[PDB]
Design a protein around this ligand. Structure first.
Ligand SMILES: Nc1nc2c(ncn2[C@@H]2O[C@H](COP(=O)(O)OP(=O)(O)NP(=O)(O)O)[C@@H](O)[C@H]2O)c(=O)[nH]1
Ligand SMILES: [Mg+2]
Length: 167
């Protein structure tokens, strides 16, 4: 069983914790309690192998960007999450992507772009094609739309990072 160091990051309120807790506990967290930093270890199976996932659930609201440097250096795969209902959270993604690539000093890092809250179609402001096209611009990055609430594409976020790391 191999270890995989995964990092969930993105701006405040996008559902990083809701996705992570849905994945780990199978429960949807309705409260919005801002994260400082939480970590989970979970044994899962991907492609018929036991995998030990270390999942870092990070703060969306940081005092300064350099707070993220260490977990970027240590992380092997990154789920960059925005909310399809929150324009600013999509806008914020480029800084985060660039910071990962700078800190890890490389062009190619396992990553998936996640448009969360896809159950809130009435409130959608980020189009699906918009998200797909950003992922494409990011050197054909993986992309999905998820819902922690409706349990859509939650496991797939983490499984896809494992598969990327295995390449
Ligand atoms: N309808 C819906 N609501 C959601 C989804 N994900 C999260 N939420 C809700 O959005 C709010 C913020 O979620 P949360 O997981 O705390 O976001 P976060 O990205 O971890 N915030 P922070 O960066 O401060 O830690 C919560 O009220 C949560 O229930 C989703 O897929 N659909
Ligand atoms: Mg959180």
């Amino acid at each position: 069983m191999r270890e995989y160091k995964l990092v969930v990051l993105g701006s405040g309120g996008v559902g990083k914790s809701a996705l992570t807790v849905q994945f780990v506990q199978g429960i949807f967290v309705e409260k919005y309690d801002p994260t400082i930093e939480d970590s989970y270890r979970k044994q899962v199976e991907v492609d018929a192998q036991q995998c030990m996932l270390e999942i870092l659930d990070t703060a969306g609201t940081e005092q300064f960007a350099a707070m993220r440097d260490l977990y970027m250096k240590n992380g092997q795969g990154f789920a960059l999450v925005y909310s399809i209902t929150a324009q600013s959270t999509f806008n914020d993604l480029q800084d985060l992507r660039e910071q990962i690539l700078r800190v890890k000093d490389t062009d190619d890092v396992p990553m998936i772009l996640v448009g969360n809250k896809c159950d809130l179609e009435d409130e959608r402001v980020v189009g699906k094609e918009q998200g797909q096209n950003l992922a494409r611009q990011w050197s054909n990055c993986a992309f999905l739309e998820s819902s922690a609430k409706s349990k859509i594409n939650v496991n797939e976020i983490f499984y896809d990072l494992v598969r990327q790391i295995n390449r």
